[PDB]
Every structure is written in structure tokens, then in C-alpha cells.
Amino acid sequence: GSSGSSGKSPSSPSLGSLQQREGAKAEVGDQVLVAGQKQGIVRFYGKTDFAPGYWYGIELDQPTGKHDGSVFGVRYFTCAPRHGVFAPASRIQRIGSGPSSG
């Protein structure tokens, strides 16, 4: 019983990193994982118009994307019909950690 003595709650909304300048986990031209399932590669990284914050225009291999490259008329990258998928970085994961290694 009883959590502790005094407490352990934060005074302000702070995290490991959520106030950097153009910060990001992945980058364009790297293998990622949308929602820890759909495996793709970031083709376009930048803020969209339909939604705030930043997004990753990752392209899929099979016709199963959210859109065909353009979202609500706004285009970001060129991809096959229903291939591009925009998901929050925090929602995306990284698979590769070295473009030139062996």
C-alpha cells in the first residue's frame, strides 16, 4: 500500500524530447514501420495541410495505402495507387540504422 513518502509526479508536462527544432526519429530514404505493422520507406517528410504537426509520406509495396500520394488534393510525393501512407513519427518505427554499413 501507499505509493511512496512524498510523491513522484511531474510539476510540468515534460518528456524525453518534445520541444526540439525540426527533430525526428526517422528520415527520408530509410526503412520504417507504420503502426508497427506496415513496413515502408519514408519518401516525403514535412508538415501537411490536412493535419498539423509533422508527417511521414511513406510508400507501400502493395495497393493498401490511405491515399494515392495526394491527400485531399495536396500532393507530397509520387507513388502507386493506394500506396502512400502518412502516419505520426511516434506512430512510426525504424528498421534500419545504417545506410552504408556491413
Tell me the major beta sheet. Answer: 5 strands, antiparallel
How far the N terminus sits from the C terminus, by CA atoms, comes to 52 Å
How much helix, percentage-wise, in residues?
under 10%
Q: Write the H/E string, N to C.
A: EEEEEEE
- Label the overall shape: elongated
Number of helical regions: 0
Tally of structural domains: 1
- Please name the CATH architecture: Roll
Rg, alpha carbons: 18 Å
Question: Helix and strand layout, with pairings?
Answer:
Elements: E1 31-34, E2 38-47, E3 54-59, E4 70-71, E5 74-75, E6 84-87, E7 92-94
Antiparallel strand pairs: 1-2, 1-7, 2-3, 3-6, 4-5
Structural write-up:
It is a single chain. This protein has strands at 31-34, 38-47, 54-59, 70-71, 74-75, 84-87, 92-94. The strands form two sheets. It has a five-stranded antiparallel beta sheet, with no helix packed on it. A two-stranded antiparallel sheet has the order 4-5. The protein is elongated, with a radius of gyration of 18 Å. The N and C termini lie far apart (52 Å). It has no helices and seven strands.
